[PDB]
Design a protein around this ligand. Structure first.
Ligand SMILES: C[S@@+](CC[C@H](N)C(=O)[O-])C[C@H]1O[C@@H](n2cnc3c(N)ncnc32)[C@H](O)[C@@H]1O
Ligand SMILES: C[S@@+](CC[C@H](N)C(=O)[O-])C[C@H]1O[C@@H](n2cnc3c(N)ncnc32)[C@H](O)[C@@H]1O
Ligand SMILES: [Cl-]
Ligand SMILES: [Cl-]
Ligand SMILES: [Cl-]
Ligand SMILES: [Cl-]
Lengths: 389, 389
């Protein structure tokens, strides 16, 4: 194993709070940190956690091509990896969602034989699902960059969710500190009219970046986007959500091959599971407490845990070590290098706990931490299967 | 404002480390916690952080409809909200991505006039982007539930990414503790053959759930999925990634309306930005260090910060308060109730810092924490615009 590593992490969107515990731990452990974030409280927070940080944002300039900036950002990181250092790069949101230089730097490091990894983070689309109260599963989700959407004529589906990033800089390859002149926004609006119609809703979304702020969740018709006062509000952190225009019917051949009908009625196209999408045009009110829902709630009084349910049955020493492996990158590296040596130095473990850690396999760790009933083993991670039908 | 609130949060996918700082803080502050997670180290961690927790997983049972379980899960949470308590629900990953009961409970609470919010988390798709080294922006992403994909005959795009959740339980509406009998998996494989061809790649993806584990990133042809030994490996935490089959050309009308050509050549369909997607079939090698890349790197020696760059210029007292607002839900609530009273009780703030906190607006906070050069204001969040073209 060569000296030198690159780990790229995210900060999430809302200042400080949306950073993951592991992103923080890698920032603290790093020899050198390079960052690109867009609020000052997050920047100040990062600087309290490591003594050797560099702001990547200084490599943008007026009329300097963004591609040249991204090549420079990547090279600054990889140069320190080649010197044998543990390097961490930090980007706002998820560091691989609509980001060029992270993928470039990781690919170069990997090709030259260094350790290289991206840790996921909370994206602007993750925030959109939470704030607009929608699930990508119901009824599917298409996600594009707005200029790419137009130039490559990417297809829409009127029966699924549509999410468009970078709607505030249609057709722009450069940078300006004061901001974008979004003079080709009308080209996007023309496309949305063609696909959806002039009276179809478009939601202008901006996630709150400070903890006390509310999100922007402003619904407009496609036609209203042509009004100059409304067009002016779309900027560099704006995303569009376009809800479905209609409900898609079921395929009879698939119903039969999956054996879903006992010769009769599947639910109708608009027999929706509560709650319905509030952004869809002409969406009917769905009943939250149907007779079937009331009967399920009545069964709560007599409920007992099923006999095949596996209750947690662990110890402080075992929960402490599993927490340490997740929150201490040095401890994890030590454990990975020698499972047996590490396991034998952990204080207060029971014999079973020690043995499970020595092996490292999931089933062993599960047996050590959960009580498995006889019922279960006289007959496999089974985590809300979602129902869309 | 009525007493009682519901906040639903996520844990991310990888044990403990992928929880956000704000998710942890709300779990600690809650009067009552309800959770549904699928590894025991995460469960044990949650129980160390609040004294009043209930496992929602005990409401599943063999041959009990999942919809009835979800109605029960929702009702247990909302009952405590109606009593005037601050309630937190916890689901693995992102709590609104392929999850029924979170959306139901939040909608009921909101309709009855209680405070209701979802905090985003790291999803299985977020992990997929990071581990497979792909960006949803290049060249767009379609995301579906596998049974819905089949039953509603949802469209594919051979030029964009495809992600399918719940490929281990095609056509199943119920639960079993030992697991799913995935006997209709061949119906999915038939559809993938029709859309992509028998020799097109499909990546079987399972994100690591413990910190020391590696992810499963196993590429197969569509044809290979019919082999019983391979089909057997697909389970309840399996997701499929299907890469594009071809590159989409540019539209001449849009090129002209966005003014991208000076009468000549736009880059060719396969003149890719480094790095290329390694999962695409017959993808050519892309040069990481072209002459333009070498010239950009040569400019690093003479680089200085641009005159319109805004360096961080804050204080310990200001960074401490902004951190507290993000990490202490009680402090945030106090600040939101009375900006001026809160601001005047914060120790050691400068006059400008105090004034910015009193107002609460983003531009005021930015001025207080960053030095704004004369160059800038003699002429707006501008955070990697991604280039896809
Ligand atoms: C270069 S990308 C970076 C995205 C980021 N890595 C992420 O994980 O969301 C910039 C685009 O992200 C979206 N974005 C960034 N901040 C946002 C916010 N606060 N609300 C909504 N969308 C945002 C916008 O579409 C913006 O044009
Ligand atoms: C009911 S959903 C819940 C998803 C979860 N809320 C999230 O944010 O990803 C279950 C599906 O998520 C995906 N999933 C869950 N854990 C996973 C893992 N470790 N790797 C890949 N996919 C996973 C699988 O497609 C699975 O069938
Ligand atoms: Cl969060
Ligand atoms: Cl029931
Ligand atoms: Cl993370
Ligand atoms: Cl340059």
């Amino acid at each position: 194993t060569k000296a030198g590593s690159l780990t790229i992490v995210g900060t999430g969107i809302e200042s400080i709070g949306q950073m993951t515990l592991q992103a923080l731990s890698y920032i603290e452990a790093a020899a050198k940190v390079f960052y690109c974030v867009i609020d000052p409280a997050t920047e100040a927070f990062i600087l309290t956690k490591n003594k050797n940080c560099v702001d990547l944002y200084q490599y943008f300039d007026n009329g300097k091509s963004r591609l040249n900036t991204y090549t420079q950002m990547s090279e600054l990181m990889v140069r320190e990896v080649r010197k044998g250092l543990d390097v961490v790069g930090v980007f706002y949101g998820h560091p691989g969602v609509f980001v060029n230089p992270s993928h470039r730097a990781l690919a170069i490091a990997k090709s030259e034989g260094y350790r290289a990894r991206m840790l996921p983070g909370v994206s602007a689309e993750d925030c959109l699902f939470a704030d607009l109260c929608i699930d990508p599963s119901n009824p599917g989700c298409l996600t594009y960059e707005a200029s790419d959407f137009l130039i490559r004529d990417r297809p829409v589906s009127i029966h699924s969710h549509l999410v468009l990033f970078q709607v505030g800089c249609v057709g722009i390859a450069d940078f300006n500190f004061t901001g974008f002149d979004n003079n080709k926004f009308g080209v996007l609006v023309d496309r949305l009219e063609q696909e959806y119609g002039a009276e179809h809703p478009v939601v202008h979304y901006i996630a709150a970046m400070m903890p006390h702020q509310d999100p922007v969740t402003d619904k407009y018709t496609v036609a209203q986007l042509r009004e100059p006062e409304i067009a002016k509000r779309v900027g560099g952190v704006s995303t569009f959500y376009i809800p479905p225009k209609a409900r898609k019917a079921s395929n009879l051949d698939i119903i039969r091959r999956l054996e879903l009908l006992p010769a009769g009625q599947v639910p109708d196209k608009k027999a929706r599971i509560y709650p319905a999408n509030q952004w869809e045009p002409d969406v009917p009110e769905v009943e939250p407490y149907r007779p079937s829902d009331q009967a399920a709630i009545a069964q709560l009084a007599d409920h007992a845990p099923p006999e095949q349910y596996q209750p947690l049955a662990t110890s402080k020493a075992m929960s402490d070590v599993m927490t340490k492996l997740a929150l201490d990158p040095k401890a994890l590296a030590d454990y990975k290098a020698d499972h047996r040596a590490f396991a034998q130095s952990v204080p207060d473990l029971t014999p079973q706990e020690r043995a499970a850690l020595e092996l490292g396999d999931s089933w062993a760790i599960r047996c050590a931490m959960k009580n498995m009933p006889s019922s279960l083993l006289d007959a496999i991670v089974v985590g809300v299967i979602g129902v869309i039908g």
